[PDB]
Amino acid sequence: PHKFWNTQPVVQNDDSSSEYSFGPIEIEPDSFRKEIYKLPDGFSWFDCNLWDIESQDFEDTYQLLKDHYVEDDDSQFRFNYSKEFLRWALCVPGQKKNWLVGVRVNETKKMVGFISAIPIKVRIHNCIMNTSVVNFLCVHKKLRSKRLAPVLIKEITRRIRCEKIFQSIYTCGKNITKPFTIGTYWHRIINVKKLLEAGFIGIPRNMTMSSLIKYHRIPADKRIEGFRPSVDSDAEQICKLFENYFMKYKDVSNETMNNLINYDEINHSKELGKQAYMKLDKIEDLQDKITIHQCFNVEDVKHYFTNIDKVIVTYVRENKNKEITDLFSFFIIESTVINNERFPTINIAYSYFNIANTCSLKELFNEMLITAKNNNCDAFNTLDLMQNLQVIQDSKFIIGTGRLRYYVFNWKIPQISPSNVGIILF
Ligand SMILES: CCCCCCCCCCCCCC(=O)SCCNC(=O)CCNC(=O)[C@H](O)C(C)(C)COP(=O)(O)OP(=O)(O)OC[C@H]1O[C@@H](n2cnc3c(N)ncnc32)[C@H](O)[C@@H]1OP(=O)(O)O
Ligand SMILES: CCN(c1ccccc1)S(=O)(=O)c1ccc(Cl)c(C(=O)Nc2ccccc2N2CCCC2=O)c1
Ligand SMILES: [Cl-]
């Protein structure tokens, strides 16, 4: 039974009612608490200085997450985010310094808690809005099960609402409240023997070692030409590429797409904010379209769809008129292999956003797989979001352990298919 989430504007696991399928759960621009939340005696809030990669805050945050962030259910693996990755994932265009939130023990000066928000722009059906993503929530193992996490959630909620933002998106490896979709990870295994020794994959009973190796082998015999690393001067062309992609796969009419409700212009008023409520005739109306996605301006594109060693890879294809026609991208995270002396870490690539116009999506993903292999990744991960089932189906991808639950704070989204979701979190 919930003692915190029962009190919050989210869809509850037992709730189903309103005649509107989409729109804000509440419109409360004036009534939210603005006084900072108290921590237990001996603890203090701090704004975490990730603006200097050499700072002590950055070292403490890196160590905190290294030893206390997300593990798989069997506690065999734990993410080991690099400082360069954290800098890229959190020091994003428009970021606020007070949205990087730490908890420090006064007596020891040790950082024992972290929570972060980043600003993003999204479309949800017939509305657009500036919103937030909450990520990297983390409490030190010795402080778990003491109801500290709700204090962190309430505090970042306060700091986001002070910027006039009243919704947030987050994902979780667990069922908390009712998720609006569930994402399933799939693996393309690159280094079979290493990942078998690390316990990331098993070998089945009626299969020889050489059969498992051959099963997962990458043929680099079929290649397609013209892909190159993106550079900053590609940002206008990439921006238009994403615009055209989201127009192609939108779940609303051409008329609505050109008259999207801008929630930021009405969220100050209970009366006007009601304009964001929308009924859905039938769920099948959404089939195979995107219902919710991130939106990128040129500054965003320059930040995210770049190339940073061991962090993010983005390649683009050009036509002879130097139009950019295709894009693949993936980010990279190292994970600790807990208590493994032989292979103490593994390197996993994660599909980010991909746009195939002049080749098939399998062909695009094949060039990306080869590129991930060339970036010393041990496996390539893809969710079944967007159109990624076209590459998972009838392929060598194998299912991952765990499920990603997608959540929206203070908005109503009907339960939808992951193919209707274009939100990738770090
Ligand atoms: C407008 C703006 C809104 C902004 C806010 C939007 C919401 C953002 C929400 C956060 C987005 C996170 C996105 C990411 O970063 S997902 C990754 C989260 N981090 C980890 O899994 C790392 C390892 N685990 C830990 O560090 C701790 O176990 C954490 C800190 C997760 C919980 O610490 P602890 O184990 O010591 O528990 P507690 O006794 O203090 O508190 C128990 C309460 O906390 C609820 N709980 C537990 N885990 C989660 C969770 N992952 N999301 C939301 N709620 C969670 C739980 O249901 C229960 O409440 P209720 O069931 O009684 O009701
Ligand atoms: C052994 C397999 N893996 C693993 C699991 C836990 C820790 C370290 C590695 S895995 O293949 O990476 C994998 C597969 C399925 C799931 Cl559901 C997850 C997972 O927990 N996600 C997740 C959960 C909460 C917060 C962030 C993430 N994250 C961060 C990055 C992207 C993302 O989803 C990971
Ligand atoms: Cl308080």
Ligand SMILES: [Cl-]
């Ligand atoms: Cl609580």
